[PDB]
Paper text:
A similar cleavage reaction was observed in vitro with other enzymes from diverse organisms, including a snake venom phosphodiesterase (SVP), mammalian ectonucleotide pyrophosphatase/phosphodiesterase 1 (ENPP1), Escherichia coli RppH (EcRppH), and Homo sapiens NudT16 (HsNudT16). In addition, although NudT16 was initially characterized as a nucleolar U8 snoRNA decapping enzyme, it is involved in mRNA decapping and expresses across mouse tissues. Given the versatility in the recognition of substrates with diphosphate bonds, we and others have used some of these Nudix enzymes in vitro for processing ADP-ribosylation to a unique mass tag for site identification by tandem mass spectrometry (MS/MS). In this study, we sought to understand how HsNudT16 binds and hydrolyzes different forms of ADPr using X-ray crystallography.
Observing that His24 came within close proximity to the adenine base, we also designed H24W mutant to improve base stacking. H24W and F61S mutants behave as dimers in solution as shown by the size-exclusion chromatography profile similar to HsNudT16. Contrary to our hypothesis, the structure of the HsNudT16 H24W shows that the indole ring of the tryptophan, instead of improving stacking, protrudes into the adenosine binding site, as demonstrated by structurally aligning with the HsNudT16-ADPr model. H24W mutant had no significant activity towards free ADPr; consequently, the Km was not measured. This is compounded with the loss of interaction between the imidazole ring and the oxygen of the β-phosphate. The insignificant demodification activity with H24W mutant with protein-conjugated ADPr as well as its Michaelis-Menten results on hydrolysis of free ADPr could be explained by the position of the tryptophan in the structure, which suggests that H24W occludes the recognition site of the purine.
Numbering used by the authors:
A (entry chain B): 4 to 182
B (entry chain A): 4 to 180
The structure:
């Protein structure tokens, strides 16, 4: 897909929709079976349309900026625990020309505490969106199991919204969250 | 993949292993967007290997029964709120046998109240397996969006464990989908 600089993405015409996406993650010393290290807890969401994506949403008229809407979309999607933290410009990573009509996507990534992250998993089922535009949260498995396939490689065979799969890969590399 | 009656599978030597799956569902009057009926809320686990499947698991020998073992497995995976109900032999649907691995797979379905099922979802992250063998719970979308693609058919392009996708399609056919 077509990478764009943030400023050129804000410059696009009035017929463009802007959509904001957050990778929310925290460190995880946990060990699966006491032997495979999780390394980090990273969240993704099953969308209404059967696809895996990131938390976020379309920025609306009364949004004074990308971040105020992003955070607003998160609270609607994840519930009150999202209020504990605020995704900010420093967390911004990239902007992409999405798919379909005139849509451009902004990708953020925000390190939390494991308690913060867990507190968002635990309340996510009382949110406005849940059971409607949102079907379920899952953690991205960062390990590859003994048969060579189960874990991350298998998990990437799933359906992703737009280009989420590519943004995820890029972010695990840039943030060093594998190997 | 062959189909077996229960007593046939229960006769088989002790070294054969047993795996038991439960499809938990509940009527959901909900309307997605105000326009698309949900009909039923059904739950699926995303297992540790990246594959989606029903809650369930292997029986160990401290499990007396197919059902104790199944019901043991659900408490571990979904938490305390699984105790609201017990999956019984009356909810048995079928059994299947594989090629290579010597395991019989038994399939169950258990009708909940919607509040029962939401308590299972709400309580799910305090379950022992959460963040280890279970990565999270999804609902199954039973609709198809206008495009013929978004919804159930895309949900079906995910990766699944074993006979889950099939077991789901089987259960949807009986329910009136
Ligand atoms: Na599991």
């Amino acid at each position: 897909a077509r990478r764009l600089e943030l400023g050129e993405a804000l410059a696009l015409g009035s017929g463009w929709r802007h959509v904001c996406w957050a990778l929310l993650y925290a460190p995880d010393p946990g060990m699966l079976f006491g032997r495979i290290p999780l390394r980090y807890a990273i969240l993704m969401q099953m969308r209404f349309d059967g696809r895996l994506g990131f938390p976020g949403g379309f920025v609306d008229t009364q949004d004074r900026s990308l971040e105020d809407g992003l955070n607003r979309e998160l609270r609607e999607e994840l519930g009150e625990a999202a209020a504990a933290f605020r995704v900010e410009r420093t967390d911004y990573r990239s902007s992409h020309v999405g798919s379909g009509p005139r849509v451009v996507a902004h990708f953020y990534a925000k390190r939390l505490t494991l308690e913060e992250l867990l507190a968002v998993e635990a309340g996510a089922t009382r949110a406005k969106d849940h059971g409607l535009e949102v079907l379920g949260l899952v953690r991205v498995p960062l390990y590859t199991l003994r048969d060579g396939v189960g874990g991350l490689p298998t998990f990437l065979e799933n359906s992703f919204i737009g280009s989420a799969r590519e943004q995820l890969l890029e972010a695990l590399q840039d943030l060093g969250l594998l190997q």
